[PDB]
Design a protein around this ligand. Structure first.
Ligand code: HEM
Ligand code: HEM
Ligand code: HEM
Ligand code: HEM
Ligand SMILES: [Ca+2]
Ligand SMILES: [Ca+2]
Ligand SMILES: [Fe+3]
Ligand SMILES: [Fe+3]
Lengths: 741, 741
């Protein structure tokens, strides 16, 4: 139509960004750290062939995966980082062995000059002993073989049953036999060794490791590279130059037009079809998983202060429901109820778009989608419970058990079933619009972008597939962030914006041109830095030095739209003071004003704190990622889902009022709990934990005696005072939404 | 009045910030690096007592001061940094002497292990050999005495006459006998030694030097401290949290009111008093110094590519007008014409405020101020010329010669004379308002803030005094930035804002309440981060570690108002499309739209690039400070001064039109030259020079062979293509402003 410039600008953004992203994925396949054919000692004692590295990667997913610790930065934050911990134990062992056969003392009775000699001899057998080319063989001296063999007792004790290594499994919140089979418990440490090898060995040509000198290890001069500084001083310039240049466009290209609303609620005139009346059970589920998901959060936060249970009447608590299991359930349920809220908010708009009716048997397909959703959520949680007690045979662990990679913890069978359910939902949504496209009216522009976003949110769960059980780590780390970063942080902020404009145009709150030109210009800024910014999750996990130059500069244009979001929060807050009928949809509009607030304090202020490559170097794997996780995820998409189901509750029982005094408590208790469990517990621990990782190293900030310090312990204990408030607010909102329906 | 909350908020900001600033100045006096009583060798050979350090600091100001090089970071950018250069030469000499008496090789035939031993022995005689307490004595080993004595030939040759050290004085753009007296040329190197001593010696209690580990020197582990990282990750959070939270206030607390203008130019009805007609010679001077100041800029940029002259018919060019002299004149003239523009813009408003008349002998005072200004500008430039040829006796050098500290280069006599002239100007301005205060009308609120800013800009040149010739360096470095940072970057952005609101309220463009509540709320944000942010100029010059925590976090609230400045650029640009009489004052309003643009790209984007303590660590003293200097200073205050004198030109000859086609060239040539000499010459050199200082050290990025690299030489040569454009634009604007009057 007349928006032909705004459509071309959007097609030109998608073409150039999906090539920067696709080309840098063609290099992850051919520049990732390789699995060496053999790791031979210097003498010739072959040790740890590659198929044992793969058997250890498979044995790692049966222990809980990234939910029990963290490997190469990604994982949980209670047990240490196994790469940065193995590396330091092996380095200190090598040093204490070489200091004995040279001077006769244990590296600490040794004077600083000889400490310098020993350290400059250490960081040359680790760094410049790369993978031999023309054959995947890695040659290791005979002191490094004795250093590895002397630290294996500790790890056998921490992952197995050992009366000596109690009080260290309780501090890591680990069940006793995390990996019972001692035959597989030794192949897992081959995988741990390989991960610490790729993190301390120079690339075949450069002077930095395969992980860009990650993590911080002063013993071998693991420090930020030079372009690590340059590309981090550059992204700040791009951010500050785009913030004030978009505020310059907003002030010259926006006239603040004025509209008069209709007299009576133009959506409350369309009577409910038989399919829209089926959506009553979809609303109760979006706030039932929400209360189940928040209880599991307070139940997994209990293991971080005690490590054991309360239930001295029955079984062992930490044997069937350990920290890994409750953490997996508490992370997975946060995706299900959010996605359910978006699904029901779409399925409500579908029949209204088709004039006023349902084309065929929508009520049958809607009920089928409901049943499939329950099958997925139930079978996934049953497979997670069996795959951690090791009742399930280990060969069926990747397909029906626990994948071991967070945000994709459900087995592959349930993953395929969920993808099929998503395709069915997309089919229904698209089926209820082909009559609105085929029409001799004018301006189907605002409807085309809407169905574009509908397709996007339903299709981009497929990249979670095409990575197998035995594929390299750096490859799944690249396809996992196509569904966690791209399908959520960049495709849900287009569906939500288009749904805002569509809904608020049908209710006569905005003009036809203002709602289709501002949405179509906000769908380009959300993909200019959203698509190639995927690579800010792959800095230090096996990607080249150009990945952290592309992801650092593009994800800075990803904060530019978010901090100027007080402009749309005033528009949504004023819509309620326009009529006496628009004052009924007040609490739905009040959640959309909170979405805009947390989209700039959670995803823009605390999201850019950890974005630059030099900040994330010392910070990856600490409690600031959890600040950002809770703030961004809930504050944005949780309030989005709650507002959507509260707006669907209304118009579905248009005879029940909203009980202001129950929602004034529910709203502010949620908003006061989220700020409570950030400003008094999460952020102080993250800042004390950041100071230690800059002076000493990541091995220290995550160690057992550092997390138990009588200050970090009375600080993750005070978090409970701010979590009961949050649970109360969730209870209030759930009670209200159930009373309505 | 009714703005009693906005006045109290402003008094509460001034009270708390001027105590943070005053308390951190009470510590500069008692924590600065001290002048040691004696510097005795180990044996007992006393060397370089403190009065010789002071005699060398005095002898340093007679060589040009900070205009010939840079000491401790502050200065010019053609000759090296003398602290970071002396330090590295002495360290490498010490190493090559100790490597001879230990192994017999010159530290480069020496294997890496012995290089580690030598380096860990070097960075313990330099760091942990602090000032002996209870008496100001510093004990130096006998190798460090032989290392100092072996590098003095090079410096005697560079500051004196030596046929061998030609082609190194031409590369530094230095006249031959920069310091002729060999008796004083040796006491200056005592001052150089002391500055490199304070930069490589731990504080009496801490593990960092007196200059917070500056400069970057890998030989002695001069690297950023840990709180250097923490307070730099914190200021970014404050910046991003204030940007989006003020945009949230602007959107909820501003209604976009509408006003109707009067029918005819309410200021063009007041007839000109005999004093306002004297301001015709003030306008010609503001654009005569502007063309003289821009020519000296292109004349001092000529020494950076050749080092000598063109004038083979007369004398020696680089003997009477060296690089130091033209640089001093080109920096000092930029303050005079800017201040002159502000002065005349004030003296024009003074009689209009007094109803319509002049109280007493006002025109006599105006002519007296003119004569005093010419005496100052002439005597200063005469004293600078004589004090560099060493014709003036050296005892009268601080009072009538060259102070040696940039932005305060004029002698102290002319400084006192300028302060007296400023007090007289303030007297006139305040005298023409006592009848407008004494009145039984209402709402003298918008007039009180105006005279407040008038007092501020005239009084705060006094802190440039109370520092003497022999006061410690860290003390003058603290009083110099009370007039360069506070009296300009924080007191001229209040006078200009108040003058905007006052003028545009008298012409009926804004409401009475909108102009006195937004100005009074913008006078508090410009002092919340403007007053304590002074300390971001004192990071690495002798201040404690708390100064770079206070200045880093407060100067981040100093960018918050500047990036959201596209909001006031649309208001000023629209005022011209309101009448056929308001369309005459178009080019004055067009400069105020450029002031707002450069106040966010020059002072907000490139100003925060070098603000954080970890950015400035590797960057202080490079060509990014010049990018920021030109962009900020001209782009903001130059366009302010030009717009003020173009608005005073009109209303002073209300019969001459503005010749659009001459101002369309003048405006865009200036705006295209400023972007030209930044994006093609200054910024590329600064970025290539930043990369070298992060890998090697500041001694390398500033060295002679690095600045002569056939790429940095064909890049400061291409700058001339973008400077002739700027000179052309200045010529156009000057021609127009002279044609008017
Ligand atoms: C009382 C309420 C809550 C409590 C006590 C809580 C507690 C926790 C705990 C203990 C963890 C794991 C920390 C670790 O691995 O050491 C976590 C992680 C997480 N929680 Fe919550 N949570 C709560 C509410 C929520 C809500 C409402 C959401 C909504 C999406 C949510 C989403 C997440 C996510 C995404 C993570 C993963 C963080 C990461 O992997 O870095 N949580 N939470
Ligand atoms: C808008 C909604 C957003 C959501 C829901 C979200 C969610 C998350 C979550 C849950 C994590 C934790 C991943 C993990 O534990 O492995 C994460 C990581 C991260 N986020 Fe986002 N995010 C959002 C926006 C942003 C934005 C705009 C930025 C801009 C810089 C950003 C920067 C980062 C970075 C650098 C990480 C990596 C942290 C780490 O790996 O420890 N996020 N995000
Ligand atoms: C064609 C126009 C100009 C040229 C070629 C020019 C050139 C230069 C040069 C060569 C320097 C010294 C660089 C060094 O020390 O190595 C300098 C510094 C400076 N110029 Fe300009 N300049 C021009 C215009 C201006 C204008 C219009 C202003 C208005 C205020 C200005 C203000 C300054 C200031 C404040 C400095 C000090 C920079 C510092 O100390 O870091 N210049 N300029
Ligand atoms: C608004 C008008 C401003 C003007 C006219 C201005 C002017 C200047 C000038 C000429 C310099 C060079 C000083 C020297 O060579 O020693 C400088 C330094 C500096 N400016 Fe500003 N500035 C302004 C605003 C700002 C702001 C808002 C910031 C915010 C961070 C800032 C940050 C800095 C820093 C950190 C330095 C030190 C650079 C160095 O010492 O090399 N400036 N300023
Ligand atoms: Ca995680
Ligand atoms: Ca300077
Ligand atoms: Fe992301
Ligand atoms: Fe400043």
């Amino acid at each position: 139509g007349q928006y032909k410039k705004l459509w071309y600008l959007l097609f030109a953004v998608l073409a150039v960004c999906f090539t920067i992203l696709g080309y840098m994925g063609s290099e992850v396949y051919k520049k990732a750290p390789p699995y060496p054919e053999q790791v031979v000692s210097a003498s010739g004692k072959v040790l740890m062939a590659k198929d044992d590295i793969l058997a250890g990667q498979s044995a790692w997913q049966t222990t809980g995966g990234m939910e029990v610790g963290s490997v190469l930065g990604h994982g949980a934050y209670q047990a240490p980082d196994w790469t940065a911990d193995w590396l330091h134990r092996e380095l200190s062992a090598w040093l204490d062995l070489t200091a004995q056969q040279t001077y006769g003392k244990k590296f600490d009775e040794v004077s600083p000059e000889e400490q310098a000699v020993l350290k400059t001899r250490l960081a040359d057998e680790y760094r410049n002993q790369s993978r031999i080319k023309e054959d995947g063989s890695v040659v290791i001296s005979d002191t490094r073989v004795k250093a590895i063999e002397s630290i294996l007792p500790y790890y056998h004790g921490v992952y197995g049953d050992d009366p000596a290594l109690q009080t260290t499994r309780e501090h890591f919140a680990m069940k006793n036999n995390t990996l019972p089979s001692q035959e597989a418990r030794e192949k897992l440490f081959d995988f741990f060794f390989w991960t610490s090898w790729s993190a301390s060995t120079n690339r075949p040509d450069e002077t930095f490791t395969y992980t860009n000198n990650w993590p911080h290890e002063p013993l071998i001069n693991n420090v930020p590279t030079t372009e690590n500084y340059m590309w981090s001083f550059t992204s700040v310039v791009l951010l500050l130059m785009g913030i004030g240049l978009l505020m310059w466009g907003y002030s010259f290209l926006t006239k603040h037009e004025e509209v008069e609303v209709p007299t009576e609620d133009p959506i409350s005139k369309v009577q409910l079809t038989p399919s829209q009346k089926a959506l009553g059970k979809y609303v109760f589920l979006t706030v039932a998983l929400f209360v189940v998901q928040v209880l599991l959060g307070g139940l997994t936060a209990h293991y971080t202060v005690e490590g054991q249970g309360f239930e001295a009447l029955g079984f062992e608590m930490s044997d069937w429901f350990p920290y890994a299991l409750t953490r997996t359930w508490h992370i997975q349920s946060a995706i299900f109820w959010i996605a359910t809220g978006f699904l029901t908010a779409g399925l409500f708009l579908a029949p209204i778009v088709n004039g006023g009716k349902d084309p065929k048997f929508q009520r049958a397909g809607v009920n089928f989608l409901y049943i499939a959703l329950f099958i997925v959520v139930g079978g996934s949680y049953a497979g997670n419970f069996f795959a951690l007690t090791h009742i399930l045979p280990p060969e069926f662990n990747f397909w029906f058990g626990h994948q071991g990679y967070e945000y994709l913890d459900l087995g592959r069978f349930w993953q395929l079933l969920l993808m099929v359910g998503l395709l069915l939902w997309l089919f229904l949504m698209l089926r209820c619009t082909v009559s609105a496209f085929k029409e001799k009216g004018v301006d189907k522009n605002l409807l085309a972008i809407f169905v574009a976003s509908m397709v996007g949110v339903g299709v981009f769960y497929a990249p979670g597939l095409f990575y197998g059980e035995k594929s390299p780590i750096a490859v799944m780390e690249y396809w996992r962030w196509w569904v966690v970063h791209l399908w959520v942080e960049g495709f849900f902020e287009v569906f939500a914006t288009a749904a805002f404009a569509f809904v608020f145009y049908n209710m006569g709150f905005v003009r036809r041109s203002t709602a289709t030109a501002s949405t179509l210009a906000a769908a380009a800024i959300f993909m200019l830095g959203g698509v190639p910014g995927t690579l800010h999750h792959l800095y230090f996990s096996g990607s080249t030095s150009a990945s952290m130059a592309i992801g650092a500069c593009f994800s800075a244009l990803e904060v530019v739209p978010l901090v100027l979001l007080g402009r749309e929060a005033y528009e949504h807050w004023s819509y309620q003071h326009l009529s006496e009928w628009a004052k009924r949809l007040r609490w739905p509009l009040m959640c959309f004003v909170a979405v805009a607030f947390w989209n700039m304090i959670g995803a823009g202020v605390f999201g850019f704190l950890i974005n630059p490559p030099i900040s994330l170097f010392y910070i990856q794997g600490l409690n600031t990622s959890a600040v950002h996780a809770h703030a961004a995820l809930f504050g944005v998409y949780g309030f989005l889902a709650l507002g959507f189901v509260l707006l669907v509750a209304r118009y579905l029982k248009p005879n029940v009022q909203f009980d202001d005094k129950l929602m004034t408590w529910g709203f502010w208790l949620l908003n006061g709990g989220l700020v409570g469990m950030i400003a008094i517990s999460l952020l102080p621990v993250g800042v004390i934990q950041a100071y230690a990782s800059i002076t000493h190293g990541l091995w220290y900030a995550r160690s057992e005696e550092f997390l138990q310090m009588e200050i970090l312990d009375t600080l993750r204990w005070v978090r409970t005072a701010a979590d009961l408030i949050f649970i109360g607010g969730a209870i209030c909102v759930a009670i209200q939404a159930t009373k309505i329906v």
